[PDB]
Design a protein around this ligand. Structure first.
Ligand SMILES: CSC[C@H]1O[C@@H](n2cnc3c(N)ncnc32)[C@H](O)[C@@H]1O
Ligand SMILES: NCc1n[nH]c(=O)c2ccccc12
Ligand SMILES: [Cl-]
Ligand code: NA
Lengths: 614, 296
């Protein structure tokens, strides 16, 4: 199912037109609220006194139709940025008129075109309208992938078309959009309606729209080819672009006349159902990173942890291999290893430890240390009905537990999306004293990774996270767990912080300071840094949410460190970021800053906005 | 009959062709009329012929003595023809080749080919006999505002667009468009007796006299210049209509001779009488059909 709409500039009667548009399969109809050629005068007489009605009556469609089927269009003669003062004024009054009428009808969206560079006054008038109350209308800016001046036929004798590549010049229409919404101050009610032409530009021109709030894609009937049967199709390149749009779930709009004397619509449906799913629904949904140390996780939270068999089969294998390497065959019925699950939750690692023992044909004694008393309930009902004397549930903080003996292996799952963001280093450090001098730690090490990303959509979402009683910018000085979706990765991820266990170093200091330099090969806007992690469970057994090496594991989502102000980056420039892992005896926190190509502010100084509870 | 009077053209004998649009209300349509008695217009009860079009009439022009070429809001070019009795206006063909409102149309000298402009930014050359588009051009980078065929050269015609380009066309060349050397141009008019000279009005209300080789101007109107029509005299007069609801008659040097303000709304068209050259008809969205007597 593809949500599509019909664009028109000729509507003899909304009753009929809307009927044919529906019977063909269109979900909604874009059309002008006033006659497109019905130019109106607002200052000079006698034209200003033109008796009404100034347009159609709202009584021609039920309230529900105006709210769900009709998308308004700005009349094409309105030029708020015209060079003639008289024309600006008339256009200003007419734009407000049609905008106010669209709201009067409760239209779900209203279309305005971006077809030249300077739209300053257009944005002002729209901004003033948007600030005439807190209403729920949407404004789709119609901007072309390629400016009309850059796709015209060369057929002008004394005005030959450009024949030398202009890298930035070919991205001009994005600059049109960027400036418009920067003037409008990133209003959540202003989205993009990307218009596609018969000829697609370079890839870098198309990639420029990654992370932008694309709500609709406009497809003129002219760009459609014709197969043997005589039906409209699309070049393989256009098909590829359409697939990039389906992942954004945009509403495709069909404009122009029928040059194949609903076929166009059927082709889109044919394309949608032709393509190959777990996190569906969490796309770009900002969440607070879990803090299992400071907070006690809820039952269903542990349920999600346990709904990932590939993750614990990796734990089982890591334990399977470790047991073999420690218990020689000549000691399989005499050597019992002491395994301590530090953070057992509801008992997944405990069961993984058991199955790894029968697999390695060795003997083990299990301790299940868990500080969450609610989960300890699950473990002890599990221990009474099933496990038994083999498992010793310990309801304590691993940093305070006075162990009766020492462990040959300690297994923990204290890692977050940013590796150490749940304070696994501080916990495994404290739990280190009761580790035998030759004891193994699973995981044995872990590393965090960062990557500069561009996504005006996600930037606005963080912007909307202001709250009544806290710093007005605190939403930018804290990380968010999010299934990153509509964004642009600007450089290959690089390693940030790494920790090893057991940590034998004489000066155990978990604070960190790292400087990263990301080459950027595109013009873009930096909005934040995505964060991932990798971990070595034992040897070659590993887990990773890092994209290039992702464990083929539905668990961790990526983390996101935003920045207060977007940072423009030119192709070839280097993004230099600074990340700190700070701490006192009470809390641990990150501080980050950008130092190139421009310095940002140090984010979250002294954990004023975000701390991790110890 | 619709309220917004769009076009008005006299033919050889003297009949008046009216193209109207419904630019507001329930139905946004249009119609075509023929008043063998020009004084009866726009009264529908005393007309020679009429027929309703599906959409509005953005522009039109005669195609001989019984042909009517129309540019429709629907994006199609239309050809209507009077019967042998000139009492019925029957549609000859309706081709939807443009992807937006057809804003301007004009017949070429031979009366067998026409050029159409459209808000889709395209200009197309039409073969009226075969009812097909010979060529399809995309020279401008914005809405095409006006296209006017050469009065005597069947392969030359002008066109202006909101890209601020005035283009001289000669389909005899590999690159058939030439850019002719301000404010956006909105109306084009070839000179009746020079062929290499034309005039054009802008959105700022200025009318200019331009010669083929590489300039005289004058502030005529207070708003957009919607149309320009030369009179049939030996040394023609220049009539200019504007959104300022005024009609002006200029001389050779672009000096004002006549000034009419009868209209109470936009003045959309103006046509000279082939029977009396001192009479000039005008129509407007106020639904008026005024007959002016221009002093000579
Ligand atoms: C699998 S998510 C992390 C689990 O480890 C537990 N955990 C985290 N920190 C500690 C700690 N210091 N001592 C004991 N259990 C802990 C949490 O309560 C949760 O069950
Ligand atoms: N230790 C935290 C954690 N552990 N295991 C998971 O599967 C998971 C998934 C999402 C978020 C956090 C987690
Ligand atoms: Cl949140
Ligand atoms: Na919609």
């Amino acid at each position: 199912r593809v949500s599509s709409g019909r664009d028109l500039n000729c509507v003899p009667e909304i009753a009929d037109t809307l009927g044919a548009v529906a019977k063909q399969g269109f979900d909604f109809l874009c059309m002008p609220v006033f006659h497109p050629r019905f130019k109106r005068e607002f200052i000079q007489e006698p034209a200003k006194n033109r008796p009404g009605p100034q347009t159609r009556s709202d009584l021609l469609l039920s309230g529900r139709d105006w709210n769900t089927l009709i998308v308004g269009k700005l009349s094409p003669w309105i030029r708020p940025d015209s060079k003639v003062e008289k024309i600006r004024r008339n256009s200003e009054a007419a734009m407000l008129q049609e905008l106010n009428f669209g709201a009067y009808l409760g239209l779900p969206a209203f279309l305005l075109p971006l077809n030249q560079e300077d739209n300053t006054n257009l944005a002002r008038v729209l901004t003033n309208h948007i600030h005439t109350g807190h209403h729920s209308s949407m404004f789709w800016m119609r901007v072309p992938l390629v400016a009309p001046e850059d796709l015209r036929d060369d057929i002008i004798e004394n005005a030959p078309t450009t024949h030398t590549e202009e890298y930035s010049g070919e991205e001009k229409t994005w600059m049109w959009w960027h400036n418009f919404r920067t003037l409008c101050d990133y209003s959540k009610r202003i989205a993009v309606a990307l218009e596609i032409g018969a000829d697609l530009p370079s890839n870098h021109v198309i990639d420029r729209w990654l992370g932008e709030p694309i709500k609709a894609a406009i497809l003129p009937t002219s760009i459609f080819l014709t197969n043997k049967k005589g039906f409209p199709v699309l070049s393989k390149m256009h098909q590829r672009l359409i697939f990039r749009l389906l992942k954004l779930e945009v509403q495709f709009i069909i404009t122009g006349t029928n040059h194949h004397s609903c076929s166009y619509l059927q082709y889109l449906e044919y394309l949608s159902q032709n393509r190959p799913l777990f996190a569906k629904g969490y796309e770009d949904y900002l969440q607070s990173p879990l803090q299992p140390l400071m907070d006690n996780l809820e039952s269903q939270t542990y349920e999600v942890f346990e709904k990932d068999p590939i993750k614990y089969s990796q734990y089982q294998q890591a334990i399977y291999k470790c047991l073999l390497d420690r218990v020689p065959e000549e000691e399989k019925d005499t050597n019992v290893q002491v395994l301590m699950v530090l953070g057992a939750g509801r008992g997944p690692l405990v069961n993984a430890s058991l199955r790894a023992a029968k697999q390695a044909d060795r003997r083990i004694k299990l301790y299940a240390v868990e500080k969450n008393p609610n989960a300890v309930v699950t473990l002890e009902n599990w221990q009474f009905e099933e496990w038994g004397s083999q498992v010793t549930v310990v309801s304590s903080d691993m940093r305070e537990w006075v162990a009766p003996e020492k462990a040959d292996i300690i297994v923990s799952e204290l890692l977050g999306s940013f590796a150490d963001n749940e304070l696994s280093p501080e916990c495994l450090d404290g739990a280190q004293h009761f580790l035998k001098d030759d004891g193994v730690s699973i995981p044995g090490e872990y590393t965090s990774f960062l990557a500069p990303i561009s996504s005006s959509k996600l930037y606005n979402e963080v912007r909307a996270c202001r709250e009544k009683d806290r710093d007005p910018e605190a939403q930018f000085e804290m990380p968010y767990v999010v299934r990153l979706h509509n964004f642009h990765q600007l450089s290959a991820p690089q390693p940030c912080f790494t920790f090893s266990h057991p940590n034998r170093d004489p000066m155990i200091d978990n604070n960190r300071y790292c400087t990263l330099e990301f080459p950027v090969e595109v013009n873009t806007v930096l909005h934040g840094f995505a964060g991932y992690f990798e971990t070595v469970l034992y040897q070659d057994i590993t887990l990773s949410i890092r994209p290039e090496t992702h464990s083929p594991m539905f668990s961790w989502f990526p983390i996101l460190f935003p920045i207060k102000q977007p940072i423009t980056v030119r192709e070839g420039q280097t993004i230099c970021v600074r990340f700190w892992r700070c701490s006192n005896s009470k809390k641990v926190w990150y501080e980050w800053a950008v130092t190139a190509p421009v310095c940002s502010a140090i984010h979250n100084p002294t954990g004023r906005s975000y701390t991790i509870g110890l | 009959m619709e309220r917004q009077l769009e076009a008005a053209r006299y033919r050889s004998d003297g009949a008046l062709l009216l193209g109207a649009s419904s630019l507001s209300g329930r139905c946004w349509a249009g119609s075509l009329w023929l008043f063998k008695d020009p004084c009866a217009a726009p009264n529908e009860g005393f007309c020679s012929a009429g027929v309703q079009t599906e959409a509005g009439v953005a522009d039109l022009t005669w195609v001989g003595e019984r042909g009517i070429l129309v540019a429709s809001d629907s994006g199609a070019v239309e050809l209507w023809e009077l019967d042998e009795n000139e009492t019925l206006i029957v549609s000859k063909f309706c081709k939807y080749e443009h992807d937006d409102i057809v804003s301007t149309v004009s017949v070429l000298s031979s009366g067998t080919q026409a050029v159409s402009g459209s808000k889709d930014i395209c200009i197309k050359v039409w073969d009226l006999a075969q009812q097909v588009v010979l060529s399809s051009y995309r020279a401008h980078a914005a809405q095409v505002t006006c296209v006017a065929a050469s009065p005597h050269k069947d392969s030359v015609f002008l066109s202006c667009s909101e890209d601020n380009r005035i283009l001289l066309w000669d389909t005899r060349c590999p690159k058939p468009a030439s850019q002719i050397g301000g404010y956006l141009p909105t109306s084009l008019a070839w000179h009746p007796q020079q062929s290499e000279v034309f005039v054009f009005g802008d959105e700022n209300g200025t009318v200019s006299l331009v010669d083929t080789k590489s300039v005289l101007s004058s502030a005529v109107h207070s708003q957009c210049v919607t149309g320009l029509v030369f009179s049939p005299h030996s040394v023609p007069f220049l009539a200019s209509l504007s959104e300022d609801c005024s009609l002006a008659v200029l001389d050779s040097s672009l000096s004002e001779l006549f000034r009419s303000q009868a209209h109470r709304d936009f003045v959309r068209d103006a046509t000279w009488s082939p029977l009396n050259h001192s009479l000039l008809t005008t129509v407007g969205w106020d639904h008026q059909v005024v007959h002016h007597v221009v002093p000579t």
